[PDB]
Each structure stands twice: as C-alpha cells, then as structure tokens.
Amino acid sequence: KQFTKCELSQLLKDIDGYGGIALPELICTMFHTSGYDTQAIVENNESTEYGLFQISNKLWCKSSQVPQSRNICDISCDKFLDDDITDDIMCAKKILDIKGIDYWLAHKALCTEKLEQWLCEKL
Numbered sequence: 001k002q003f004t005k006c007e008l009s010q011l012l013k014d015i016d017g018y019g020g021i022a023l024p025e026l027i028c029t030m031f032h033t034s035g036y037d038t039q040a041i042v043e044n045n046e047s048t049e050y051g052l053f054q055i056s057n058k059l060w061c062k063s064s065q066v067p068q069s070r071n072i073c074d075i076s077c078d079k080f081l082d083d084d085i086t087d088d089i090m091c092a093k094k095i096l097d098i099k100g101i102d103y104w105l106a107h108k109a110l111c112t113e114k115l116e117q118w119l120c121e122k123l
C-alpha cells in the first residue's frame, strides 16, 4: 500500500495542529521519508526503520535486530509494515510528543517553505 497525496491527506486530516504541526508539512515530510509506502524498510548498521513514518527499531519499536531497544511505542516493528496505519499514527504522535518533528530529517530540509503544493486537490 502506497498512498497518493490525497488519500493520505484525508486519513491524516484529524491530526492537523497536533504538536503545532501543519498537515501539509507532515505530508511533505512523509513524501521524502517513505514515499507514502507502508512497506518501506530502510536498513544500515545498528538499525532498520519501518513503514510510512520510518520508525526506528533503535528506540521506538521492538525487533530481533536490536534487543536492547527501549521500545517506546510498546509494539513490534512488523506492525508498521501492514496496511493499517492506525497504530503507526499512534506511535508517530508519541514521537511528536517526546522528541518533536525533528525526528524526520526531511522536515527542516525541504518542508519549511513551498508548502502550497502539499495540499490536496479534489476527488
């Protein structure tokens, strides 16, 4: 499941304003982060990041790769690879609450201006 800009927008609509974050800027961040793909898996040394919001097994979810993980979202990382983003949103709201929008590098780099394009058209 790879969403289009409008699909995701409607799904995340209730969340505009959460953490002081504007929906378009979150839309832009996700675009450069996973391309709105619920199956994105990105790996490196000490870790792997999962799904839509690219949540890290290093601190946020539990995976056999990093057994010492604090597992802040009390959930295994496979739950971020399925079609239901409900739980991904709950963990992401946790990240926003604790760390802030800066968890995602793409926000400060490409999502603080030219936001008009990240707005949904009409279906």
Ligand SMILES: [Ca+2]
Pocket (backbone or CB within 6 Å): 079, 080, 081, 082, 083, 084, 085, 086, 087, 088
């Ligand atoms: Ca999920």
Ligand SMILES: [Ca+2]
Pocket (backbone or CB within 6 Å): 001, 038, 039, 081, 082, 083
């Ligand atoms: Ca999926």
